[model samples]
Target: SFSGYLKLTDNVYIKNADIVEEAKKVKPTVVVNAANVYLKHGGGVAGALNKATNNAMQVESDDYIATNGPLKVGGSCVLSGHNLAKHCLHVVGPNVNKGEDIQLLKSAYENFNQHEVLLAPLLSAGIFGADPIHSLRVCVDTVRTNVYLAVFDKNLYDKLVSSFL
Candidate 1:
């Protein structure tokens, strides 16, 4: 019975998981966008920012957000997605579940916000996969300190980690 399974299959683990509250606390250097090729601020942390900032990303990335892609699975792109933070890097995760999502997440952490403290979502979790806890561990392992998980649900995280035995 290994844990880190998703109970909600959305929002990292549950619905109404507000990233803005967490984002406010950290005041992240970069609010990394969980984006697709379309660059629509639609789900997970991306969706939360869209709601919180009132589509600032849409206007900000309008010139660059393209139909093909700003990045591939392991590629990266920087953008002014929100007015709240210094920058946002859209790291494209796996579009399909072919077991290569972890690499994509790691790539997001690797070069995008290199040597900079960044507040990022649980990459490749929510809509991409259902195990945010596992994804988080991978994220923490991927970077020394460049990637930090924006904790909106402290209790949820605590509970999730407690089940690691």
Candidate 2:
């Protein structure tokens, strides 16, 4: 298994697929996206969701973090506009170094404890600037039960799946 994952249930499995395509089938309990404390939706997972939902993610993000402190490493907030999922969890992760931030990732994952099924994009892996390997490691470590790590490249799919076995 990859050092941190604990896939304990069938619901927790990795797919070699796109998040938007995966989202078409499930309105997951939680839809998490990476963000700056400033909530810039112009890049990474935040941008995609914003585009799909058409909720002006940029404005909403700025408004949220304006009060939430421009960029707190682990601070998080939820938003509506569930075009695909039931709700959104905007987690403030590192905006630099391609998001290889395990501390911030852990903190963000912890915030989703109340929800059962979470649909999350590979935070920090895309425009958010995170190492894909590290991001996948944190994700599998965090969501041991019911969560989907959306993928366009499926780079971490095997590792994520193997972690469960």
Candidate 3:
């Protein structure tokens, strides 16, 4: 894991690492999925997370949407973590072209501010077309405590490493 110190009210740092493997090591932590409003785990980080949990997250996501409703942009909902973590928060981020993209993306991270240890990905930075640097900035600013950003791409990881510098 790559870690960078952040000056905050408490001793906090943000880490960049592989999600599927590194996340499992944090017992009693929560994993954040960059999910859509529908919470489908089709591909990208969602797919990898679903695969790691053996599709149990997808099943709970389906049930969540079926009973409650479709999760809105900047909205989030909790689901079973199975053998992964204590819980999983499915956060829906705005598309790059959407208005209030930054606010909405920040809201996604804000949804789990009460948690102790969180493992999150760069939401909306993949197929959704959000800029990785901007997305990372929003996440870094919003998350005031201990958190891990599951950065899977080598190139993007290097850029993020530069970002903290």
Most TM-score-accurate candidate: 3
Could you list the CA RMSD of all candidates, in the order they appear? 7.5, 5.2, 3.0
The candidate, 2 or 3, that scores higher on lDDT is 3
lDDT tens digits by residue: candidate 2, 1-165: 112333435555555666665665666666777776666677556677778777665666667666766756767778764666667787776655654455676776666566776776666566556667676667667654577665666446666556545
On lDDT, the leading prediction is 3
Ranking by lDDT: 3, 2, 1
Candidates' TM-scores? 0.72, 0.74, 0.85
> Clash totals for all models, in order?
0, 6, 0
lDDT of each: 0.61, 0.64, 0.75
Model 3 collision count: 0
Deviation (Å) of 121 in candidate 2:
1.6
Clashing pairs in 3: none
Cα deviation of 89, candidate 2, in Å:
0.6
Error of 1 at 161 (Å): 2.7
**How well does candidate 1 match the true structure, expressed as C-alpha RMSD?**
7.5
Candidate 2 vs 3: which has more TM-score: 3
Residue 9 local lDDT, model 1: 19
